[PDB]
Design a protein around this ligand. Structure first.
Ligand code: U5P
Length: 256
């Protein structure tokens, strides 16, 4: 079991994964902020204040009421300044020919600003092939959704195994997983886990929470993704620091 810094140097590492792992090690953070807000100003103020505490900022561009490409330029300035990646949680899930256009084009031009995107595996490997046609030339990476945090998830058993095989067969572009646990035994792949809070509970629409210690320490994931546990708190900086310290110590204690 290797440190993030050592995993950044693995022979088969993807450049996006390497950049991420190096800044995780440098900044002692394995926290991804889920910036689930509707105002550009709030997104940018969170990115600036929490930038030092996070390895990654996850977006849902399609809920920003005042999206423009200039907002994403300003977010990139902050990502470069504070050293974090931008992950658009778009969950591409269509045929290859369609997702290529949804990734490159339209109003959002996701591929122009997102270091990482993700995809569901249910359509078969054409979803990855279509994305990679845009993402490989743009030096991007992708995460496959192997497990989900929500009640009634069908991403279990053979489905999870299919996601791992699809990732391991598209390693030029796929850099890891959305999962609740370590699902790949190959250390070149990242594991990012949403459904994380310090306290037990859930929401009223099927979200289920587990703690950083559970998902990083016991379940062997790499990165926690935290939305409301930070966003709904009064002091979002202190909340981010609490989640960062929790995830980082769970990782260290796992390492030995
Ligand atoms: O299995 C998954 C994959 C993605 N997300 C996303 O991660 C965030 C979780 O936010 P919260 O429940 O921490 O507020 C949301 O943006 C949600 O869309 C999940 O919650 N579960």
């Amino acid at each position: 079991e290797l440190s993030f810094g050592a995993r950044a140097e693995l022979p088969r590492i993807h450049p996006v994964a390497s950049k991420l792992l190096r800044l995780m090690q440098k900044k002692e953070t394995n926290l991804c902020l889920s910036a689930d807000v509707s105002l550009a100003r709030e997104l940018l103020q969170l990115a600036d204040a929490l930038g030092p505490s996070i390895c990654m900022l996850k977006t849902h561009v399609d809920i920003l009421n005042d999206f423009t490409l200039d907002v994403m330029k300003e977010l990139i300035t902050l990502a470069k300044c504070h050293e974090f990646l931008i992950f658009e949680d778009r969950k591409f899930a269509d045929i290859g020919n369609t997702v290529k256009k949804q990734y490159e084009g339209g109003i959002f031009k996701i591929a122009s600003w997102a270091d990482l995107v993700n995809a569901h595996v249910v359509p078969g490997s054409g979803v990855v092939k279509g994305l990679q046609e845009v993402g490989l030339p743009l030096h991007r990476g992708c995460l496959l959704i192997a497990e989900m945090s929500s009640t009634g998830s069908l991403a279990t058993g053979d489905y999870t195994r299919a996601a791992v095989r699809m990732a391991e067969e598209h390693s030029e572009f796929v850099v890891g997983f959305i999962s609740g646990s370590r699902v790949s035994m190959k250390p070149e792949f990242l594991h990012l886990t949403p459904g994380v809070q310090l306290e037990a509970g859930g929401d009223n629409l099927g979200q289920q929470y587990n703690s950083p210690q559970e998902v990083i320490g016991k379940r062997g994931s790499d990165i926690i993704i935290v939305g409301r546990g930070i966003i709904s708190a009064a002091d979002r900086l202190e909340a981010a620091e609490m989640y960062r310290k929790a995830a980082w110590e769970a990782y260290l204690s796992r390492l030995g």
